[PDB]
Ligand SMILES: N[C@@H](CCC(=O)O)C(=O)O
Ligand SMILES: N[C@@H](CCC(=O)O)C(=O)O
Ligand SMILES: [Cl-]
Ligand code: NA
């Protein structure tokens with residue numbers, strides 16, 4: 420049968436290009452937690468697949484003036500991919516336009532910053548401007564702030580929007596480099612913060628989780644794969660395989 | 671007017687309780703708790719009315735391996751005796767094959783409730799011994815996790831629990847807690863409930879970490895159009911901070 424087109428995005432340790440001396444081709448180019456997930460789903464559900472990086476390099480958000488989506492979400496809306504297998508947050512706004520499996524990992528927004536300071540919460544960032552802060556452009560964290568009616572978060576959005584050419588970044592990698600190289604705190608998902616802090620010992624999580632969400636496999640709205648992938652994820656969780664995969668990649 | 675939805679649930683503090691009062695209470699007004707607040711919010715978002723009914727057999731739901739039949743809230747949904755189950759109903763592999771669930775409103779895992787002051791640190795330490803008995807709620811998700819597991823520690827635990835089932839499998843969390851308090855017994859329990867119980871009984875503690883990871887969701891019959899609508903409403907309530915407020919209200923030490 421037809422191979423499924425799987426959209427994804429580079430994001431350590433979920434999706435990476437493998438290091439090698441010989442050039443690599445096709446699906447053999449990729450590794451990571453989400454790549455191992457995809458391999459397991461493919462075996463359980465009996466499909467073949469072709470991995471393609473999302474061409475615009477975005478997770479996906481809606482344009483406020485023209486209403487169009489971008490990123491992996493737009494690829495699914497337009498039926499240019501069958502699945503999105505990535506650290507793709509299940510959110511209110513996205514679930515209205517695409518379908519998601521139940522989550523394979525749970526997480527929340529938190530803060531990445533340097534050690535040694537009195538900053539302990541988002542509220543502490545919101546009430547000042549000397550320490551700048553920001554988020555990945557056109558992802559779920561940005562959209563959370565953009566939509567929030569909560570005073571603290573609304574104040575933070577006004578700051579990030581004002582300063583967006585500087586403080587909104589195109590990747591978590593760029594956000595980390597800003598924390599390391601300037602007085603900047605990065606609003607980041609907690610799973611990714613756990614990976615970064617285990618490797619950058621001068622960095623830490625500030626405060627707790629601001630919210631709660633899961634990562635799910637995206638599908639176009641109405642896809643029959645959505646419920647089949649949910650059941651496969653639940654099987655992998657119960658057998659311990661997801662925990663083993665997390666340990667492997669967060670080591 | 672549209673037909674009221676029948677909502678099956680089960681008593682379990684602090685998710686669903688009977689309100690304390692002097693005058694008798696009637697109908698939906700009898701109930702309070704996190705899940706009751708959740709139901710009220712869903713009803714307003716989606717625009718339905720409802721009638722709360724306690725599951726007749728008092729069970730969450732498991733399948734009989736001899737006759738293949740389900741019981742509990744799961745069976746009430748399969749049979750269309752209820753439109754929704756709004757309860758601390760775990761989303762599990764075996765259940766998602768027969769009923770539908772919303773995406774989770776809370777995440778949790780199985781862990782161990784025991785008395786303080788012990789060298790027992792994990793499920794492995796319990797599994798290797800038989801002086802301290804252990805068990806779970808009959809016909810719920812924790813029992814079914816053990817019954818199905820291929821992992822050596824957990825399969826060994828299941829063999830023990832199955833052998834001693836008439837004594838160590840209980841009908842409710844409340845009964846399990848009483849057994850921990852009155853005998854040398856450790857109870858396999860969901861972590862959100864452990865947190866509630868240990869906040870209020872300072873002689874008790876969680877032992878070890880989470881054995882697994884799962885969510886609670888609203889159950890519906892398979893194919894129900896309410897499933898996706900309730901998912902969207904849950905996501906809205908989470909993002910607005912209302913689920914967090916509800917958890918703080920119902921879990922609000924030792
Ligand atoms: N995982 C996010 C991107 C990173 C972020 O927004 O922090 C998403 O699905 O949009
Ligand atoms: N919440 C469980 C019942 C309690 C338990 O199994 O620990 C269920 O949905 O079956
Ligand atoms: Cl779902
Ligand atoms: Na959807």
Ligand code: NA
Nearest residue numbers: 680681682842
């Ligand atoms: Na009960």
Ligand code: NA
Nearest residue numbers: 689690691692
């Ligand atoms: Na009374």
Ligand code: NA
Nearest residue numbers: 766767769770
């Ligand atoms: Na289902």
